[PDB]
Amino acid sequence: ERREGMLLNLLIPFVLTVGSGSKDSPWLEQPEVQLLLQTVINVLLPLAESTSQAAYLALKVILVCFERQLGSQWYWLSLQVKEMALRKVGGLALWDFLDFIVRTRIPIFVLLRPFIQCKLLAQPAENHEELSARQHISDQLERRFIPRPLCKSSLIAEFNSELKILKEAVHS
Amino acid sequence: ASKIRYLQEYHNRVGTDIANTLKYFSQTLLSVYQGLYVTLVTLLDLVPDLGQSIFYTTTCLLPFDVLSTLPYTMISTLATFPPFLHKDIIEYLSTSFLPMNLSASSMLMIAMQYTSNPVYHCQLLECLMKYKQEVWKDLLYVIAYGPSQVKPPAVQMLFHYWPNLKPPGLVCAVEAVISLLKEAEFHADQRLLSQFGIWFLVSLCTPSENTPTESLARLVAMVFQWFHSTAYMMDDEVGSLVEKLKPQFVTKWLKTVCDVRFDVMVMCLLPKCSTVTQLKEGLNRILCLIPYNVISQSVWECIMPEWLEAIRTEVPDNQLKEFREVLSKMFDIELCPLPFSMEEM
Structure with a gap:
């Protein structure tokens, strides 16, 4: 009942201010990065739609801003993301998170490529809303390179815009 | 079948009885699951000699659909097992690779991250080569998208198994070059990454009219950022070798791309975290490019008006002093080795 406000008011702004620039x-040490990652995943794994969206946005922000700081912590993150996909934690916008992972090709993308390609896409689609995202992910997987990343500025701008949109949507 | 349940219960509670049950499973399978693998995958978490006996059952079963998921999970062991088990896992992978598609790339992402011994991933690449026609794309993915500490071994193995990648003296390759050059900027074996990236750029990157505009623009932007990063590096023996080899290769390639594709060369140097700081960084990048005589009179006439207009408009009126030490360093004939006279400048 208070984690949503923490994510959208403190945690995401804090990670945006520290990681970017x-x-x-x-500035942030390894134990703090571990603690923030644990906090986000605990918001995720052990859920409300807005809470899940905020958690996934925070997960993206931590993955991008604190990519170097994570270091030898990609296999456990891949396992946690695989568990999230298996549990359908997001329900909605989980496909958006996977699409973001494929777009940015973040160090977890190389680990999650087999699960997304051979396994995840093998499962049939349920609704057209998820069907469109699944088709977009499949298109982005093969026959689409699209080198979007550029000095992390565009990613941070995207994160800030999504944070603003979610903040405006929460209060309304 | 009750032995599987006993093994599961023992694992839940925790090789006295588990090892004997695994031997029973192995000897039962040898004479002649689908329901057994649910505990076989759990055997990976069970271990944290004994691991060799644990994996001997899997080695018996593999020659004996879901098999596509078998290697990666087994390769996943490398990320949790104690260091001594890595050799046994590598040996089992090599031995049982004969019964053994993209997941192998991710395998390197593990094998090149947790195992410090070159021999392990060298043997993995050797056994993948006999069953994968194009193993270079796996290492390209690893270098382009994987993190650090994975890029050095992947580059070393890529250059070891492909001697043709050394010049005398498509999109995935561009991304790998971009990542390799960004490694140097992140540093500011670090210099070895820059050296290998420059070698690969000279080898398998020839600018032409067939090159996509976006790919060439990204490549030139990373080249300029890498030049700026290498400018401030300390001068050591490796530093001296880098600073001597760079005019031979990077300057030559920049000259070639400017001669062939001038549009991208101009677009990369245009001004296009604060705006003032970004303009200062771009101006410093141009000033760093200046000593290598990359900028000709055409480049100057094409880039300087835009930079001055951006300084006039985008920068506020805070005395503009922040840019002075840059601009005063770019508009001096004595300071810059440009053959430009006052009329030309």
């Missing part, structure tokens, strides 16, 4: 962000 430079290629490397040594």
Whole structure:
């Protein structure tokens, strides 16, 4: 009943302020990055739609801003994301998270490529809303390179815009 | 079949009885599951000699649909097992690779991240080569999208198994070059990454009219950022070798791309985290490019009006002093090795 406000008012703004601004962000130490990742996943794994969307946005922000700080922590993150996909934690916008992962090709994309390609796409679609996202992900997987990343500025702008949109949608 | 249930219960409680049950499973399978693999995957978490006996059952079963998921999970063991089990896992993978598609790339992402011994991933690549026609794309994916500490071993193995990648002296390759060059900027074996990236750029990147505009623009932007990053590096023996080899390769490639594709060369140097800081960074990048005589009179006439207009408009009126030490360093004939006179400048 208070994690949503923390995610949308403190955690996401904090990660945006600290991680962005430079290629490397040594302001935050490794234990703090671990704690933030645990907090986000605990909002995710052990859910409301808006809460899930905020959690996934925070997960994207932490993955991108704190990519270097994560270091040897990609296999566990891949396992957690695989569990999220198996549980259908997001329900909606989980496909948006996977589409983001495929777009940015973040270090977890190489680990999650087999599950998304051979396994996840094998499962039939339920609704047209998820069908469109699944088709977009499949198109982005093969025969589509689209090198979008550029000095992390576009990603941070996207995160800030999505945060503003979600903040405006929550109060309304 | 009750032995499987006993094994599951023992695992839930926790090789006295589990090892004996695994041996029973192996000897039962040898004489002649689908329902057994649910505990076989759990055997990976069971272990945290004994691991060799655990994987001997899998080695018996593999020659004996879902098999496509078998290697990755087994390869996943490399990320949790103690260091001594890595050799046994590599040996089992090599031995049982004969009965053994993209997941193998992700395999390297593990094998090149947790195992410090070159021999492990070298043998993995050797056994993948005999069953994968194009293993270079796996390493390209690893370098382009994987994190650091995975890029160095992947680059080293890529250059080891492909001696043709050394010049005398498509999209995935461009992304790999971009990542390899970004490694140097992130650093500011770090210099080895820059050296290998420049070698690969000279080898398998020839600008032409057939090159996609976006790919060439990204490549040139990363080249300029890498030049700026390498400018401030300290001068050591490796530093001296880098600073001596770079005019031979990077300057030559920039000259070639400018001669062939001038539009991208101009577009990359245009001004296009604060706006003032970004303009200062771009101006410093141009100033760093200047000593290598990359900028000709055409480049100057094409880029300087836009930079001055951006300074006049985008930058506020805070005395503009922040840019002074840059601009005063770019508009001096003595400071810059440009053959430009006052009329030309």
